[PDB]
Write a protein that binds this ligand. Structure first.
Ligand SMILES: [Ca+2]
Length: 258
């Protein structure tokens, strides 16, 4: 009955590996686009179906390769994922938000036929690492049509975002670049009490946890994107009544479980 529902009923262990879809990549050259530095699109193959879109920003001095594992992971569970490069390696979080805005518009309007055919441009979300997570929160405030936002070990000088876009923030306990007490947790706490929000804190994790295969980041990011981009209530099970020994903190207003 849910026309956006993709793939078989999920199990926890299936969400810690690549999923039911084959994946192709498309390189968006820097010279071919304005408003962002290009990037890599991960999109499903072996399918005639359409999927939601995710634009994802790396952090300060990083490029799209720093989130390649998660682009491919997400695409393999049924998403079109554009991991950007930034115009400059030194772009701040609000510049990253602007480049996510350009990436979303690029996905909708000028992505190649191969990607457009797999994309439902009505269902878009954002995610990002560190300053890219900051950009994720800013664009969530500016664009109320986004289905979800997943800031990963996010960094921003702005601690206050006004959005109703559902937010799941991943903090890293041992993060020395974007300490959770100064970044992730203030972001979580200052989001509106009426916006569905989750904070998960990875035990023992560093700022670079998001840059390689991470079972917790995989489960929470797939689950949040499924729940909100696809309206796939089958993923509530991983986001609700959570007892996860990989986590050393969890905070929610439990507006996503019913
Ligand atoms: Ca603010």
């Amino acid at each position: 009955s849910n026309p956006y529902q993709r793939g078989p009923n999920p199990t926890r262990s299936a969400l810690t590996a690549d999923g039911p879809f084959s994946v192709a990549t498309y390189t968006v050259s820097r010279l071919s686009v304005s408003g962002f530095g290009g990037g890599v699109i991960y999109y499903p193959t072996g399918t005639s179906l359409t999927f939601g879109g995710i634009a994802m920003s790396p952090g300060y001095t990083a490029d799209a390769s720093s989130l390649a594992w998660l682009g491919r992971r997400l695409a393999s569970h049924g998403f079109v994922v554009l991991v950007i490069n930034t115009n400059s390696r030194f772009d701040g979080p609000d510049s990253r938000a602007s480049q996510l805005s350009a990436a979303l518009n690029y996905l909708r309007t000028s992505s190649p036929s191969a990607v457009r055919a797999r994309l439902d441009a009505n269902r878009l979300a954002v995610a990002g690492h560190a300053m890219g997570g900051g950009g994720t929160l800013r664009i969530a405030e500016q664009n109320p049509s986004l289905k979800a936002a997943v800031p990963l070990t996010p960094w921003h000088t702005d601690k206050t975002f006004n959005t109703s876009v559902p937010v799941l923030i991943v903090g890293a306990e041992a993060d020395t670049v974007a300490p959770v007490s100064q970044h992730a947790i203030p972001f979580y706490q200052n989001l509106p009490s009426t916006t569905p929000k989750v904070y998960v804190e990875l035990c023992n994790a560093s700022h670079i946890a998001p840059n390689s295969n991470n079972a917790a980041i995989s489960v929470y990011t797939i689950s949040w994107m499924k729940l909100w981009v696809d309206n796939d209530t089958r993923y509530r099970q991983f986001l609700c009544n959570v007892n996860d020994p990989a986590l050393c903190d969890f905070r929610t207003n439990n507006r996503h479980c019913q």
